[PDB]
């Protein structure tokens, strides 16, 4: 049986695929898919930046999609921001 | 409310914090506490690495960006990203297709 | 006048290009040309995967982010980054320290 | 013997460690180290972004340094930028 920490990491994989499996490439979250992801999965202070601004930031190779490695950038940034805000 | 992703991130944060808050600076881990987190909460994902204390020590030295012998949360979350990556890679190891399918991930 | 990094990137670009100009769109790789690049210029890094035509097909499908059966350079360079990462990982495989040392990388080299 | 392409990828690893092994953590390029890296390894159309701007973009976990995976973001962006400019005359 996996630990609670381990299950969280695997659940993060599952979160990505709820959006990446909608259409096209199975490991591609397109710009409209990222908007859906952000509206659904992220807090207001993360969505505040804007879906288009996040997409530009996450799409490192500018191929028009967010793959899993690029998605982990967003997870890292959310994690740091959330730890920062649970500090106060 | 709170989404699946937010809950997941909270788990990471709360698991780190339970160790970090005990001694010294309340938001950093020292070497023994890092080793404890790894031994307990990553006992499957890092099963083979756990068998060798020097490997675990090298992992900590690697993450310790500012080289102060402590792990901050910012330093620690890179480890979480790497294991999430490794687990997804394992899910697709030797993937031939067609279509999308996940094998078991890390520790499975 | 070119730095070491600039040269390495030039090498990736020119290796891609040598195959992308042959047929179809001059700046994308079709499956045939992708397989050729991998079997030739990645014969060591992807030696295990080169045994399997299916695996190379799946790698391309994964990389083909806009799902048009061809690889742009933008799509392709993710494979380059992954293999560079994997090579460095291999250099540190089972690293116990102390200090910093590299073992041989991918394709042992 | 590795191919020219494979040697290019291992050389990218070598380039990183010329700056990461300057001081501190062996897989950490600090803000001054990055400024050194950008000035020595990249063309002006990359450097014109600003060293401080690049650092903020590459330091994804904001821990004060660029590790190897963060460095590869810069490599990817340089590769895409270079391929783009070589299609412009
Ligand atoms: Ca992308
Ligand atoms: Ca530290
Ligand atoms: Ca494509
Ligand atoms: Ca960093
Ligand atoms: Mn997958
Ligand atoms: Mn190294
Ligand atoms: Na998709
Ligand atoms: Na502490
Ligand atoms: Na072509
Ligand atoms: Na360093």
UniProtKB/Swiss-Prot annotation, chain A:
One of its GO terms (biological process) is positive regulation of intrinsic apoptotic signaling pathway. The modification S-nitrosocysteine is found at residue 42. Induction: (Microbial infection) Expression is highly induced in CD14(+) monocytes, neutrophils, and developing neutrophils of patients infected by SARS-COV-2. Keywords: Antimicrobial, Apoptosis, Autophagy, Calcium, Cell membrane, Chemotaxis, Cytoplasm, Cytoskeleton, Immunity, Inflammatory response, Innate immunity, Membrane, Metal-binding, Repeat, S-nitrosylation, Secreted, Zinc. The keyword Zinc applies. Calprotectin (S100A8/A9) activity on TLR4 signaling is inhibited by paquinimod. GO terms for cellular component: calprotectin complex; collagen-containing extracellular matrix; cytoplasm; cytoskeleton; cytosol; extracellular exosome; extracellular region; extracellular space. It is found in: Secreted; Cytoplasm; Cytoplasm, Cytoskeleton; Cell membrane. PROSITE patterns: EF_HAND_1 (PS00018), EF_HAND_2 (PS50222), S100_CABP (PS00303). Pfam families: S_100. It is a peripheral membrane protein. One of its GO terms (molecular function) is RAGE receptor binding. Its main location: secreted. Residues 12-47, 46-81 form the EF-hand domain. Ca(2+) 2 binds at residues 59, 61, 63, 70. Zn(2+) binds at residues 17, 27, 83, 87. CDD domains: calgranulins (cd05030). Ca(2+) 1 binds at residue 33. InterPro entries: EF-hand-dom_pair, EF_Hand_1_Ca_BS, EF_hand_dom, S100/CaBP7/8-like_CS, S100_Ca-bd_sub. PANTHER family: PROTEIN S100-A8 (PTHR11639:SF5), S100 CALCIUM-BINDING PROTEIN (PTHR11639). Binds two calcium ions per molecule with an affinity similar to that of the S100 proteins. This is Protein S100-A8. It comes from Homo sapiens (Human). The gene is S100A8.
Swiss-Prot record, chain B:
Ca(2+) 1 binds at residues 20, 23, 25, 28, 33. Coiled coil: none annotated. Calprotectin (S100A8/9) is predominantly expressed in myeloid cells. Except for inflammatory conditions, the expression is restricted to a specific stage of myeloid differentiation since both proteins are expressed in circulating neutrophils and monocytes but are absent in normal tissue macrophages and lymphocytes. Under chronic inflammatory conditions, such as psoriasis and malignant disorders, also expressed in the epidermis. Its main location: secreted. It comes from the Eukaryota. Keywords: Antimicrobial, Antioxidant, Apoptosis, Autophagy, Calcium, Cell membrane, Chemotaxis, Cytoplasm, Cytoskeleton, Immunity, Inflammatory response, Innate immunity, Membrane, Metal-binding, Methylation, Phosphoprotein, Repeat, S-nitrosylation, Secreted, Zinc. The modification Pros-methylhistidine is found at residue 102. PROSITE patterns: EF_HAND_1, EF_HAND_2, S100_CABP. This is Protein S100-A9. It comes from Homo sapiens (Human).
């Amino acid at each position: 049986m996996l630990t609670e920490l381990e299950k969280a990491l695997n659940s993060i994989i599952d979160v990505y695929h709820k959006y990446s499996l909608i259409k096209g490439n199975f490991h591609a979250v397109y710009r409209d898919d990222l908007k859906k992801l952000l509206e659904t999965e992220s807090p207001q202070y993360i969505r505040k930046k804007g879906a288009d601004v996040w997409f530009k930031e996450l799409d490192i190779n500018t191929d028009g999609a967010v793959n899993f490695q690029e998605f982990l950038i967003l997870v890292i940034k959310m994690g740091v921001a959330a730890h920062k805000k649970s500090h106060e | 409310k709170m989404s699946q992703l937010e809950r997941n991130i909270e788990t990471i944060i709360n698991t780190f914090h339970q160790y970090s808050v005990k001694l010294g600076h309340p938001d950093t881990l020292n070497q023994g506490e890092f080793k404890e987190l790894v031994r307990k909460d990553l006992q499957n994902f890092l099963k083979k690495e756990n068998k060798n204390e020097k490997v675990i020590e090298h992992i900590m030295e690697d993450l310790d960006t500012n080289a102060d012998k402590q792990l901050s949360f910012e330093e620690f979350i890179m480890l979480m990203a790497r294991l999430t990556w490794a687990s997804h890679e394992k899910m697709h190891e030797g993937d031939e297709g067609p279509g999308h399918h996940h094998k078991p991930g890390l520790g499975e």
